[PDB]
Design a protein around this nucleic acid. Structure first.
Ligand code: B7A
Ligand code: CA
Ligand code: CA
Ligand code: CL
Ligand code: CL
Ligand code: CL
Ligand code: NA
Ligand code: NA
Length: 326
DNA sequence: CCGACAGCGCATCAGC
DNA sequence: GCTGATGCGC
DNA sequence: GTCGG
């Protein structure tokens, strides 16, 4: 946190551009600059020094000079004073309320937590659950709790079918001492890139986790991706644990390594790696790495037998999960 | 200068 | 109903 | 907002 003031400023600008301005490329530019500054191992002394880093340009350099000189950014001080911007920024903190829905709610005079709770009939299912657990979803998950959650998920999955493999990914697999939510990568030998020999593979696992009262709510659910809510059991006379967000992704078993690369992240790491893949003439998603032909059309999937294989194709030295927290 | 910016699953909706 | 665009999320 | 070409 050598440069935490600068990176907090850039993150707040990013959130403004995403939630209020609906300018997704500015959001991504601010996030990229915040990420490269966060890993820079010196306390930045000037905007010129920061501008040497890729993704920091003239405008961010000038903002860094203002921030270093004064401890503030007038642009953000005004954004914080703007009622409409402040209202939109708040509403988007509810899961399921994005920039478009937030602005529509503000138009209708729905702009506070209190307004949402009085207008549950105007929320879709996702938004209603996001509101229900607004406070809980703000809280981080200690690694100790992530380990108990891992134990429950891996054991309940084994009870459905011992051939399932469940892997906890995200920041947990990167070794973080706390996580924002739990991400589970699921495989089963019946589901490959060549065939689906059993139906309901994801459903059966979700059902089992609901049966044991671990999964408590569903935000969305399809054949391969579950997004929902879970909760650790508590002991006698103990306060309940907060409800937690959980994502489950069922990935073809022969595409495990591309899948675990994607789901381990971080998100900025994936964007850096995929962008670099393009410059090398490849495209990476969660299933495959493919060559790009002379016309830009993705070719056939390349053989992958490890995470490192994906790094090797794009001429990157392998980076352990703990070194991907960009 | 200016095109491009990572890539995709599920929910919701308009148009038919 | 389906298809394609959009919103929101990972 | 930034960058490669
Ligand atoms: O959500 C955003 C995106 C996520 N991902 C991948 C990579 C990421 O690691 C994993 C899970 O997403 P999370 O939001 O749970 O992020 P975590 O790294 O686990 O951090 P937390 O500790 O939970 O905050 O999905 C992307 O590839 N792109 C995204 O845009
Ligand atoms: Ca996570
Ligand atoms: Ca997640
Ligand atoms: Cl933009
Ligand atoms: Cl500020
Ligand atoms: Cl593919
Ligand atoms: Na730069
Ligand atoms: Na939101």
């Amino acid at each position: 946190t050598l440069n935490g003031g600068i990176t907090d400023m850039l993150t707040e600008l990013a959130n403004f551009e995403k939630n209020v301005s609906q300018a997704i490329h500015k959001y991504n530019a601010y996030r990229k600059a915040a990420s490269v500054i966060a890993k820079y191992p010196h306390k930045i002394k000037s905007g010129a020094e920061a501008k040497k880093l890729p993704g920091v340009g003239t405008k961010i350099a000038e903002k860094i000079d203002e921030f270093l000189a004064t401890g503030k950014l007038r642009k953000l001080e005004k954004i914080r004073q703007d009622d409409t911007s402040s209202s939109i920024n708040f509403l988007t903190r509810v899961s399921g309320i994005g920039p478009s829905a937030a602005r529509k709610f503000v138009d209708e005079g729905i702009k506070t937590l209190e307004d949402l709770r009085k207008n549950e009939d105007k929320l879709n299912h996702h938004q209603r659950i996001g509101l229900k657990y607004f406070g809980d979803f703000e809280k981080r998950i200690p690694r100790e709790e992530m380990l108990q959650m891992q134990d429950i998920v891996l054991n309940e999955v084994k009870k459905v079918d011992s051939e399932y493999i469940a892997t906890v990914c995200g920041s947990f697999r990167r070794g973080a001492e706390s996580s924002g939510d739990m991400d589970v990568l699921l495989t089963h030998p019946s589901f490959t890139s060549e065939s689906t020999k059993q139906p309901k593979l994801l459903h059966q696992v979700v059902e089992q986790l609901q049966k044991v009262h671990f999964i408590t709510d569903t935000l969305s659910k399809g054949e391969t991706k579950f997004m929902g809510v879970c909760q650790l059991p508590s002991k006698n006379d103990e306060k309940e644990y907060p409800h937690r967000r959980i994502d489950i992704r069922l990935i073809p078993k022969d595409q495990y390594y591309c899948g675990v690369l994607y789901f381990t992240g971080s998100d900025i790491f994936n964007k850096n790696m995929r962008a670099h893949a393009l410059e090398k003439g490849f495209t990476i998603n969660e299933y495959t790495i493919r060559p790009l032909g002379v016309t830009g059309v993705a070719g056939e999937p390349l053989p992958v037998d490890s995470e490192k294989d994906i790094f090797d194709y794009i001429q990157w030295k392998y980076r352990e999960p703990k070194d991907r927290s960009e």
